[PDB]
UniProtKB/TrEMBL annotation:
Protein name per its UniProtKB record: UDP-glycosyltransferase 202A2
PANTHER family registered for this protein in UniProt: EG:EG0003.4 PROTEIN-RELATED, FI06409P-RELATED
Residue positions binding UDP-alpha-D-glucose: G14, S295, I315, H330, S333, N334, S335, E338, D354, Q355
Domain of life assignment: Eukaryota
Ligand binding (UDP): N17, R242, S269, L270, S295, F314, I315, Q317, H330, S333, N334, S335, E338
Length: 427
């Protein structure tokens, strides 16, 4: 029998895209998928075969939601400016106890009221949600709720703090200070969540507690097994995709008479809006003896492309990846999953938050290299390209991860868990 399954997520693209992927798996099993989100994303939600519900239509009168949503361009632009100038340690020092995302908590009241109302009216059999932190509605509504995590999952472990980008190789003296500061700023997240939960009269829980079941999307071969097991009830989905080798993608004519390998460059939609970022990256690449495909982003028309480069604002990344030799990425989890599923090595240039942890994971596991904005040079980037392209160890590690991701039956397992919880109200 076919279930009513309700998804929601934060406004941002990582969170929306993680739910779309799981929803596609469930739709294939015959379930009716609803997605409560924002009207800007209706088209993609409906194109995926889901039923769109606007969060904004279920708002309490005092909390219309849109008023408190964050200024995403302001944040990204500020993030770039700091990452360009400051080391991660300096970043955490300059932050002065202010957490990466605790500032978003206060403004999330409206989305909470809206979800309480949606769940009550639509009466799904189960809900899934991709947020940065737990919300009170997840503990008040009258159905099981599954948090979905797409960010780097180190936060699920009793280990080094998330968001620092610390390496497994950093000795005590190197990591001590940034890890103290990261833990100090986490106290602001907790204090902010206290107020939100108090407002809704719900007992406070950890920001990533899963009451019955949580799903984190991350490849098994990169997962933090050296930290033991993730927190109670969290289960790994290795990916929501299967490996595809046949593609519609064709080489742009512009690149036909140009030497070298084929390299894909994408900083993701948020970071790419800061045109200075792509300009800094691409300028030196005019002299790299290779062919580049560039995702130029929302402000793509003002990005200068050289003779060895072809760009478009809308690249189909999964169609392209099987045909390239290297992926220069911001380190978002979905991009990493897509790159490794296609068996391609990575150069990660992290921009914000958990991407630092992903970038360092790539380096630590020999799947590519991390390059940091704060010490960026054309010389360094060009060398990183030559090194990764010709490193037979890196290319073999990536081939091994790609092969394991095929072998996954984590999809079957996770689907079965979702369906069991929906039907039985318990696992």
């Amino acid at each position: 029998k076919s279930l009513k399954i309700l998804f929601t997520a934060l406004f941002g693209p990582g969170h929306l895209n993680a739910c779309l992927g799981i929803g596609s798996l469930l739709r294939k099993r015959g379930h009716q998928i609803y997605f409560a989100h924002f009207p800007r994303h209706r088209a993609t939600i409906e194109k995926h075969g889901f039923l769109f519900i606007s969060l904004l239509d279920y708002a309490e009168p005092e909390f219309p939601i849109v008023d408190m949503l964050p200024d995403i361009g302001i944040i990204a632009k500020f993030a770039f400016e700091r990452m360009h100038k400051l080391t991660p340690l300096e970043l955490f020092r300059h932050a002065s106890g202010k957490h990466t995302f605790a500032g978003m908590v206060n403004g999330s009241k409206g989305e909470n009221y809206a979800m309480m109302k949606i769940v009550k009216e639509y009466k799904p059999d189960v809900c899934l949600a991709d947020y940065l932190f737990n919300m009170p509605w997840m503990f008040t509504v009258d159905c099981p709720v599954i948090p979905v995590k797409s960010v780097n999952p180190i936060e699920l472990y009793n280990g080094p703090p998330a968001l620092t980008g610390c390496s497994i190789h950093d000795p005590p003296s190197v990591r001590e200070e940034i890890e103290q500061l990261a833990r100090k700023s986490e106290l602001e997240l907790e204090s902010e969540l206290e107020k939100l939960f108090a407002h809704f009269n719900v007992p406070l829980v950890s920001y990533n507690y899963a009451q019955q079941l949580g799903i984190y999307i991350y490849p098994g071969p990169l997962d933090y097994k050296e930290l033991g097991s993730p927190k109670e009830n969290w289960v790994r989905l290795d990916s929501s995709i299967r490996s595809t080798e046949i593609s519609n993608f064709e080489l742009p004519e512009k690149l036909k008479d140009k030497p070298g390998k084929l390299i894909y460059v994408s900083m993701g939609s948020l970071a790419s809006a800061v045109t200075e970022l792509l300009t800094m990256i691409l300028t030196p690449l005019a002299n790299s003896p290779h062919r580049f495909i560039v995702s130029t982003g929302p402000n793509g028309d003002s990005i200068k492309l050289y003779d060895n480069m072809w760009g478009d604002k809308f690249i189909n990344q999964v169609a392209l990846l099987p045909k390239v030799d290297l992926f220069i990425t911001h380190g978002g989890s979905n991009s990493l999953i897509e790159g490794l599923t296609a068996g391609k090595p990575l150069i990660a240039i992290p921009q914000f938050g958990d991407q630092l942890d992903n970038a360092q994971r790539i380096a630590d596991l020999g799947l590519g290299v991390r390059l940091n904005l704060h010490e960026f040079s054309g010389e360094k980037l060009l060398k990183a390209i030559e090194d990764v392209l010709n490193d037979e160890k890196i290319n073999a590690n990536v081939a091994r991860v790609s092969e394991e991701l095929k072998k996954s039956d984590s999809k079957d397992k996770v689907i079965s868990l979702i369906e069991k919880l929906a039907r039985d109200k318990k696992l």
